[model samples]
Target chain A: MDFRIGQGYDVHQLVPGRPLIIGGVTIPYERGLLDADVLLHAITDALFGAAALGDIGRHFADSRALLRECASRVAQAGFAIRNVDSTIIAQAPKLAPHIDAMRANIAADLDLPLDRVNVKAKTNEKLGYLGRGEGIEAQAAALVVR
Target chain B: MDFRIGQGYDVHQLVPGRPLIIGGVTIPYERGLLGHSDADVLLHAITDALFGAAALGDIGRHFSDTDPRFKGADSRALLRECASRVAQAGFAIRNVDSTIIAQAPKLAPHIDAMRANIAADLDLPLDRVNVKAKTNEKLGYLGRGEGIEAQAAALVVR
Candidate 1:
């Protein structure tokens, strides 16, 4: 198939004192660290997976450079990034204000037009540990083709 | 560009005495996932994937859990409506791949049935709809068997 779709899910516990950052944007929030920005990690994984280049595990890094690497890997695999949509699942700290910044950062890193990247946020509806704000999780999907 | 891609994620809590319906398959389990609807997490995820791909909106934007009309709703019906809406948007769904995250119930045996239901609902070939199951491996809420989560990626073309 010329077109390939891949999905990624990543989670990190939320703790007190650490700065809360996601999608490369640091938000003013009381709670915190996600191994890296959970949103970017998920999106990067989706990019790698779509290119049939494995996941972000081995190349994992807590930096924006990870996404640039993902772009390189996709290009090396003879494919290009089409678009990606992602969601951040956190019960606290309203994310509505930061969606545009996050989208811009992701698009820039992937070298795609701003409209090609989308970011959505949702609360877990107080259903699980995430709902209790004990942790945060992110999900993403990407399409790559020759 | 003839194709567009999107993703979806849906989760539900596990509670005793409820029906465990996922991907439209009613499985017998000591505990079932909670939701205002039948709580078929997998189907809902796929529905969202399709909706997201078409830039329509998320599931909650369309169906409000607080609305009585959606109380005890069937996920299959919601997904059917979703497919229709995406079709009306001038996009044809090419394929979808999804994963169901649960620690119990051994979903492998039921995967084919789930895929069949999804394919039928989306009007796609059986080979086009893929469903996979994974255990959370004692990591968190899912590993503790407190809930079920489903994630999916979809490809659509105009």
Candidate 2:
């Protein structure tokens, strides 16, 4: 196929005193959520999904703390990241201020131009877990080509 | 441009005796989800994904939950309409990958059927559509099985 698509989703609990980092952009917050990089996990899964290489569950229970390391592995497997679109679902610590930087970080790591990556933010509309402000979640889709 | 990508997320509250439906397959479970339509969360998410990719608004924009025409609407039909709208916008769906987040009543046995249903609806080959299921590890609403959430991504070529 000339084009392939993959989707990924992940969630993490938020606690007091840790740095809030998203898409590699650390935001100033009273507390940060602890877990694997939620955005990275979603994007990584999408890339792997497009390559038919399974998902984060298989390769990355905790692959690495950095996006470049995971993205490098995808590049080594012989596919190029065409574009990526992701959404961060959180009820607190507004993310709009940091979206561009996050996009730049992923674009640079994947060796793609800035426009190829788009990051969007949405609060769970104040419903459910994310809406309750207990955790943060992310969902991503990736397009990859050989 | 030959390609555009879109992503979607949807959640539905799970309740007793409603008949759990996902990806158009009605699974046997004690609790079905509550919704204006059939509450097929997977299909709803996929519909939104396709719409988002085309920048065509969302499922609600077209099919209003308050509209009597959609009350108890079959989600399969809704998905077909979404595909039609995407095609009308001058794009063809190349591939779609999605995940279902739920905690109860194993979904593996039903995944193949779900994939087949989506492929049939979108008029794509079986290989072009993928569906995977995972648990929430019992952390929150989804983890506790109070609701089910589905996420999807679509690739379209113009």
Candidate 3:
């Protein structure tokens, strides 16, 4: 079998006034999510890295960054994506309510079937800065079959 | 072509008067990693990630937390078994990359040995396994020096 895999990590600072936007789902919270797209950004990097096309950090940030660059890279590799699995690591603003919408938004952005994308969330177990509600982080992995 | 990819994240509390074991290396530190096993956070994450990628469930599923068999179990040994299962499933590990998040006890000095251990256990070349270490920049529990976390991603081809 010939295939490639890529993984990505991202972090964002949490502040009192920012809106918590993750996986394109806006959640009501005391503190808003900082940085750019957290979950999608990590997923984009995973796709790019899995395709051996470099990483997301090397490109400029944009709302369409994940949709445009990742798709183009995967297409250039002469391979179609098999699936993407990711986890959101945050200590605050429980995301369960927004997950479904987030998944739908991501599938739409990548033009992939919803089943091909998986998203999971976990807390820091109240042990770290994340547990202290300081920031949010995300991790992602991509599988591409040629 | 057949392939699978998985990612995993794990965290262990850092406490005083325990040996800090990570990636099978015991680093000199005031606090040790806490867990049911040896608390080798890096290997645990890698093991879980490999299992997840293969759709084999997770570490807790195979090595039960309450099962006495895994009591103080060596994480390296579990990882070896994980590799064997992946191979038995007709897949060869292509590569793995992981990050260790710690706020204290510099890991750079021990990174090479850690990578060597993972590569050897998986029967892969050194270059195929990469490990990077970073501090949480004093932001969360990691920053507070209360715990340590590890995240890993794996690629397998069959």
Candidate 4:
């Protein structure tokens, strides 16, 4: 079996005005999830990286500062995605409840099989930036075998 | 070949005045562990998940929390007991990747030893037992340093 590995990290500053989005799912919280872009971008990168396709930036540029533009880039990159294993790291918004729906949405957008995808949620115990819930971040590690 | 997947999530309150225990060894931490048993919730959950994959009983079923004989029992003892049961049924552990989720008391310092301990406890290769750690950024109970939790996934082949 051919196996490859890829890892990704994403962080966003907290903004009082915006609701927090993670793994393409909107979470309800007064404090918000504290990320600029939905964490789906990081998940996309992991998929591409697992296939040795390189960073998401290589395919999609966030320079446009538009959500639709990023979504398009992800769609274009969907061609080579095989399988994914990702974890969402958050301080609040109770991600456990929303995990299944988030996985379904992401799988549909990526045109990937449900069995080939796994998503898990975790938190940092007030030890660092995440622990303090200053902001929300996500990290993913993926394996792609060709 | 037959294969199965199972998951486990366990949390133990992080108390300021107890022993910081993991796997089967004690680590030096200002805050210790919590549980009805030795509070090695990490290994306990992993053991139970392994049993689940093999279609065996769970941790609580085998080692009843209600039993006084298990009071303050070491979790590794339970780990070994579970592995033996899996073997008796002709199933073998393929791989296990686990995460130790905590806020305070960095686990990086002891990750290697913990992995080794798990491998030994399961009688598997060191690489087969992968242990990773992440801090819950000040989010909830885990973020508040009030407790520690572990999540594990195991692949079993028969």
TM-score, per-candidate, Cα-based: 0.78, 0.61, 0.66, 0.60
Q: Rank the candidates by lDDT, best first.
A: 1, 2, 3, 4
What count of clashes does model 4 give?
17
Tens digit of per-residue lDDT, candidate 2, span A1-146: 46676778888888887877778777887768774578887887788888788776686423334456667777777777777777788888878678777777777877776756777665664568687887899888787776
Rank the candidate models, highest TM-score first. 1, 3, 2, 4
Instruction: Write model 4 residue lDDT over A1-146, tens digit each, in one string.
Output: 54555556677766567777666666787766433544576665655665566676676523213323433554464434444445555667667678777667766766656754556554554435566677776555444444
Ranking by DockQ: 1, 3, 2, 4
Against the true structure, candidate 3 reaches a TM-score of 0.66
Off by over 4 Å in 1: A1-10, A24-28, A48-79, A96-101, A108-115, A122-129, B106-109, B134-140
Q: State the RMSD for candidate 1.
A: 3.7
Q: In order, what DockQ does each candidate have? A: 0.38, 0.16, 0.23, 0.04
Among all windows of 10 consecutive residues in model 2 chain A, the one with the lowest summed lDDT is A60-69
User: How high a TM-score does candidate 2 get?
Assistant: 0.61
Error of 2 at B90 (Å): 0.2
Candidates 2 and 4, the one with greater DockQ = 2
Better of 1 and 2 by lDDT: 1
Residue-wise C-alpha lDDT for candidate 4, range B46-122, written one tens digit per residue = 87567655645346567776799888888888888888988887888988888888887778888888899899989
Q: Which candidate, 2 or 4, has the higher TM-score? A: 2
- Cα misplacement distance, residue A14 of candidate 2 (Å): 13
Interface RMSD of 4: 8.0
How does model 1 do on interface RMSD, in angstroms? 2.3
